[PDB]
Each structure stands twice: as C-alpha cells, then as structure tokens.
Amino acid sequence: SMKFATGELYNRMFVGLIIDDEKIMDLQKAEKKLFELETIPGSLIECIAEGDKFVAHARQLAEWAKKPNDELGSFMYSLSEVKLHAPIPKPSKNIICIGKNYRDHAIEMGSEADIPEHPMVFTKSPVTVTGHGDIVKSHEEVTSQLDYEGELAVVIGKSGTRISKEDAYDHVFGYTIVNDITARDLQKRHKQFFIGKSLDTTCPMGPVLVHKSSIQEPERLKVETRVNGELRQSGSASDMIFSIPELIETLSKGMTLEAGDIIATGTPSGVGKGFTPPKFLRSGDKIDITIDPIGTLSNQIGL
Amino acid sequence: MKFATGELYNRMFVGLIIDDEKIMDLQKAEKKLFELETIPGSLIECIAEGDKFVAHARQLAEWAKKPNDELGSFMYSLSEVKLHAPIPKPSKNIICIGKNYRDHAIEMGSIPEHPMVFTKSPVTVTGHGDIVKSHEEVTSQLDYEGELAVVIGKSGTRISKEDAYDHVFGYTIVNDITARDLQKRHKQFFIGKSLDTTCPMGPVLVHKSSIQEPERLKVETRVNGELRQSGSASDMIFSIPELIETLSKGMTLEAGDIIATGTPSGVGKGFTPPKFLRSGDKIDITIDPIGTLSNQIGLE
Ligand SMILES: O=C(O)C(=O)C[C@@H](O)C(=O)O
Ligand SMILES: O=C(O)C(=O)C[C@@H](O)C(=O)O
Ligand SMILES: [Mn+2]
Ligand SMILES: [Mn+2]
C-alpha cells in the first residue's frame, strides 16, 4: 500500500512514505542515500504532478530500504516521533465540497425533496486546512453551531477538462479523509455556504494520502465518525448519490481540474444538526474519522 | 502607483505603469539602478512584502526619470507588452459578493441584511484582451458582471471596520462572468461561477494611495459598445470595510486575496428577453482611474 504523508520532525517538513504503519520514510533523504539522486520535489503536491513515475520511484525506494544498510536512521523515522500535517498543507485552490451526496444526510437536514438531481458544489478556503492531531478552533465568539462531517476526499492527479465518466479514475491520484467542519448558523445566514465552511482550522485532512493503485475498489470504502468515542456516522461510498466518476465528469465539464485539487465527496447521516436536541461541538470534543485503509483522522476542539 | 503583470520575450514580470504609456520592469530596473536583486517574480509575492515594496517601487520610478543610457533594458512601451491579470494565479479562490447593489438584487427577483459570499476558482482568471471561452456545449446563459475588486495587502483576522483599509493593498476590475443556468442547476454558485477563463481581471492594480476615496468609484459596463451597467460604489449595501470585517470574523484574510464587491444592475439576465453572451461579443468595463478591462467571447 502506497501511503504518502507530509511530516515534520525537528523542524524539517518532508514528503514521506508510510512503511508498515509504524515508520515513515523521508523520501528525499532516502533517494540521496540509496540511489545517490536528488529528484524528489519538496512538497507532495509537486510529487502528485509527476504521476505514476513518482509513485513507482517511491515504491522502488521502499524496496531498497528493506535491504541491509547501516544508515536507515538518517531517513526512516518512527511515526510516534513525527507530526503529520495535512498531506497537502497548502492546496492551490479551495477544497471542492459536495453537499447532500448521501440520501439519509439530505433527509436528516430537511426532507426527501431536498435530494438533489444535480450535485450541489461549494468550497472551503485553504486557510481551513489542518492535520491529524491538530486542535480545531471552537470559534465560540462567531458560532455556537459548529458541526462535524466525516468524508472521503479524492485528490486529482492528471489535469484535465471535459473528462468522461469512463476516464475519471485515470485523473485520480488518491484518497484521504476530510472533516468538513461547518458553522450551521453561518451557513443559513449567508445563504451560500462559503463563509460557514471556511472558518480557520475547520478542514482537518489526512492522516495520509493513499494512492489509487492501493485502492482499486473505492466504492467499497466505508466512512465512520466517532465523537467522544460514540459512533455518529457510518456510510458506504457505494451509497453516494453521485459517484466519484460522475462528480469528476460534472465538475470538469467547463473547468480544468488540476493536479492536487481535493474533492470532498459528502458526509453520511449522523451529523450533530440531525439529532433532536441538535448535538453541536464544544471545547474538548474529540472527533475520530476512520476510512480503512487510509486510517484514522483525529482532532480535538480547542479551549 | 499602477502595478501590472506583463509579458515580454516570453517572460512574465512585475511592472509599474509610467505615464499610462510605458511600463517599468521592476526587477530589471532594480538591477540597473542598484545592482541588487530583491524584487520577487510575482505581484502576489510583492504584495506580501507590504509597504517596503511600494516605497521601493516609488524610488525606482523616480530614478528612472534621470537620463540614463539603457532605459530600454527596463522601460517598455505598453503597446509592446502583453498584460496578464495583475495576479494571474491567486493563491485561493476569488471571494465574490452577491447582491450588493439594490437594483441588481431587484432585477434578479426579490435585499440581504447579511452578505452572500461565494467563490470563483483561480482557473477562471484571465487578463485584459484575452478571449473568454463561450462554453457553448455547457451553457447558453453566459452573462457579464462588471465589478470593483479589492486586493488585500496585509494579512489579518478579526479585522475591525475602522482598520479595514489598513489591510487593503489596492483596487482592480473584475468581470464576474456567470453561467446563469448552472447557477440554478447546482444551487450553490461555485460551478456556474468557475468555468475556465470567466474572471477577466485588470488591466492594472492601483495602490490604495492613489485612491483614498473608493466610495466615489464608478463602474460602467458596455457590451458591443452599448452601455449596460452604471453603478456607484457608494450605493453598495455593504461597504468595503464592512465586507472585510464580516469576512475576517472567523477567517484569516491573506496578502493577495481578491474580493469582488458585486455588480450593479444591467446584467443580461435582467432584461425581458434576457440578453446572454454569444461568440464575438465584446465587453468593456471601466472604472477610473483603474482604466478599462476589455474581453471578447471566443469562437464555438
Ligand atoms: O453533505 C455535505 O457533506 C455538506 O457539506 C452539505 C451540508 O453542509 C448540508 O447543508 O446538508
Ligand atoms: O452580484 C453579483 O456580483 C453576483 O455575482 C451574484 C449574482 O450572480 C446572483 O445571481 O445573485
Ligand atoms: Mn460536507
Ligand atoms: Mn458577482
């Protein structure tokens, strides 16, 4: 499984590959030591633009790193020592978000007639983006209706416009997790969702970006969200109203999708707003979103 | 102080308009005057440097008036240069205000007490004189919207109304070209607002020091010569300072962020028979003293 990450260790930010879910390889330093080359770019978004050849190079480096050698510790780090950022800490454009792409989410937010015949697409500013283990601001002076949304995110590899459904997966690099944290009152107040979706720190992403070659069946992916331990959301990607291929086809009809664009494909039912008494987030709340085999994205709402 | 992104000999460069006929290549001017190289290669990077950059640009322009042998190595006639959008590649989506003029809101079917805010993808951004794709296989309801755009010069969150202009770098023009059917179809405006090439911007970015009175600015839009729109920035429902205060309440505005402040009445959708854009149509948007932003709708 090819799982890429942006890590930080002793104030160096680096593009990393997860090895056996316990170690992470610093790909640039590994390339230098094992291949005596320096070609790997310093950000994952630049690596994504290189496509399959970067991924095959990374796979080769991981294979070589298993051969006996005496300087493993210069480039192979235990995950416990490494802070994971969002795989793409600074997207080049807003995160593209789909609204109401699971039937029961649409229903819990209103009724059956709120189910779209066409995708509802909005965005989150890049200033939302944060990583596994980061504190999300509670934004208490702005809203008392912060809510969680666990989602599967797709990262585009090959750039393209007018992409057909049939070719869509050819333009996909990989998959990560997003928490599309939303201020529900701000959504209603401003009508368009941008402001209520774009508060600082409200898009945890990660913990890793799994290359599509490790996930040939994305329709079988499952999203689970727990809030303070309690199961809130449990969706299957196959229940999406619009599939990933349809979303890519729609989005690209008149617009170029570019390497490293991130599409959040919508949350299942189970959001805070959906309960009678609504259950909004508060300081100290812990949110864990699991999609195997991406792993678990965990954040706490700040004090 | 009118800044631009020009292109000459296949190189894009940050420029300063001199006497509305010439453009100074700031990096090459600095090198020739000071034999130093500190000016960054994009306008957004220059904006992030703050007041330092503007004072340096002022100094270079003053020096460039002195006789000097090789003026032509850094001072070009505007007619020889292609102008891009001042910020050809924003670092995030353009922030757009909907319904910020009374009569625009009315002509579209009816006034907000809170701003309606959406975005345009960076892939929309294009420059003065560039062709806007007609997108005929996607929509037959392309429409025009002349607007004043504000560029943030200094990053901030929880910016007060009173301090708002302190976070402003300058002003440019945008054409917020919109597919009206796609707006209705997808409900949120993003898709209808984010077709490739549908955000002409420019032709220049005027530093705020040349416009201390933005409420007196006027937008005029002509389509094939004909006056369609005519707004005054003073009729905006929410002012520039209020928009900055609202936007930044829970969100960091960063150096180089662009806010399109809304279009007056006169849009194609506002006429009975609606007047949508077609291949060959020419749109000219004028805001003095920024100048005129001109684009043509492309071939099918
Ligand atoms: O469905 C999602 O994942 C959304 O972001 C939309 C949600 O905010 C809503 O209004 O129901
Ligand atoms: O007022 C503007 O500038 C807008 O972009 C909004 C407009 O597209 C609308 O349908 O309300
Ligand atoms: Mn969502
Ligand atoms: Mn507009």
mmCIF file of C-alpha atoms and ligand atoms in Angstrom, chain A residues 97-100 105 122 124 149-151 178-182 184 197 264-267, ligand 3:
data_model
loop_
_atom_site.group_PDB
_atom_site.id
_atom_site.type_symbol
_atom_site.label_atom_id
_atom_site.label_comp_id
_atom_site.label_asym_id
_atom_site.label_seq_id
_atom_site.Cartn_x
_atom_site.Cartn_y
_atom_site.Cartn_z
ATOM 1 C CA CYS A 97 -17.090 20.112 -1.478
ATOM 2 C CA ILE A 98 -20.212 18.178 -2.437
ATOM 3 C CA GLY A 99 -23.373 18.792 -0.417
ATOM 4 C CA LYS A 100 -26.034 16.139 0.235
ATOM 5 C CA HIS A 105 -27.912 13.017 5.139
ATOM 6 C CA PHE A 122 -19.295 24.682 -2.837
ATOM 7 C CA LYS A 124 -13.616 25.599 1.684
ATOM 8 C CA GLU A 149 -18.761 15.890 8.813
ATOM 9 C CA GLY A 150 -16.599 12.845 8.051
ATOM 10 C CA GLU A 151 -15.922 12.499 4.303
ATOM 11 C CA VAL A 178 -11.571 15.172 5.453
ATOM 12 C CA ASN A 179 -13.562 16.539 8.375
ATOM 13 C CA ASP A 180 -15.764 19.217 6.775
ATOM 14 C CA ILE A 181 -16.382 21.184 9.970
ATOM 15 C CA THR A 182 -19.252 23.630 9.469
ATOM 16 C CA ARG A 184 -24.520 25.763 10.664
ATOM 17 C CA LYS A 197 -17.480 26.329 5.643
ATOM 18 C CA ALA A 264 -14.695 16.157 -0.541
ATOM 19 C CA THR A 265 -17.464 13.810 -1.680
ATOM 20 C CA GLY A 266 -20.070 14.465 1.029
ATOM 21 C CA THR A 267 -20.847 13.219 4.533
HETATM 22 MN MN MN C 3 -19.675 18.254 3.581
#
